[PDB]
Structure formats: structure tokens, C-alpha cells
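Need C-alpha cells for this chain, all 86 residues.
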Amino acid sequence: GRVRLVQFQKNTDEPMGITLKMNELNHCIVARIMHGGMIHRQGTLHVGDEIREINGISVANQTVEQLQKMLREMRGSITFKIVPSY
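Here are the C-alpha cells for all 86 residues:
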């Protein structure tokens, strides 16, 4: 699909509300989005989307725990480079 850049503004320390999973090619896939969360309210990131980069950082050959940890500690203006899935 077509790559796009999705931007969020994270000012609080609450869970972003994303659950990730890696598939066979180690592609990072959005497994779940927390209903009513900041992400869900914006409507720009959806289950099945492939995340290629976070804050410009390639997710390649990083584990799920690593990425979730990264997501838990991010604040301010952040981005996901994603390939949406329909």
C-alpha cells in the first residue's frame, strides 16, 4: 500500500492505547486500539495497519516489548510512518 505519516500530540503519561504484534516477516502490525483513547479519537491509526517507523525510528528487528516500552515513554509531538490496511 501507500506509506503515510501520522502525527499525534501526546502530553499526558497515560497509556497511548496501542497493542502491537510482529508477523512472519517481523512486520510490526497494530493488533488493537483502545476504544475511546487518544489514538482512537483521532481515527488515523487502525487495526491491521503496518507501522514502519516511530518518531522516524525504523522498527526493524526490534521486539514487541521494546516497541511498547518506547511507546510508553514518548511525549510531545510524535509520528508513525504506516502502511494502512483496508
